[PDB]
Amino acid sequence: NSNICEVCNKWGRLFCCDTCPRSFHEHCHIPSVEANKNPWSCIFCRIKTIQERCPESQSGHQESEVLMRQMLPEEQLKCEFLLLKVYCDSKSCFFASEPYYNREGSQGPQKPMWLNKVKTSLNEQMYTRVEGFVQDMRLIFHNHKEFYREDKFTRLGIQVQDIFEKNFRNIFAIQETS
Ligand SMILES: [Zn+2]
Ligand SMILES: [Zn+2]
Ligand SMILES: [Zn+2]
Fold this sequence. Notes:
The protein is mainly alpha-helical. It has seven helices and two strands, in the order ββααααααα.
């Protein structure tokens, strides 16, 4: 197994996957690393099994269809994995915890949003469709772009949104377009 957390790239108290060489901090893994379970298989491994069980699940899909899917166990897992892929980027730090807004010439968003809030919402099964989860994730970046206006810090929102969107298209097998 690796000697650093796959998500945050630090050592520490690590839980090792039984079916692949990745390791995790307890609350870096999503869902949080399960208490017992020997062997234990990480979310990367669980996602790969879904694909292997249904090879056709990789054929291209329309985003509008994906968004209307109910949050059954497999879609729940896919959203958890997509959330984890965003935390894997170090620039996620800016969007993880609850923001506050006091900048001359700007007003804070009407509906603040942050990664840990989305994480709690997934854990509590608050989303009934994929659309719920995707809307909250896109809101994080849209709030940031609107608040920071012409400051160059707006680019951090563009960058992390790009990681989100690329991973969304990969995990949900969205049909490739020009
Ligand atoms: Zn970690
Ligand atoms: Zn694994
Ligand atoms: Zn099949």
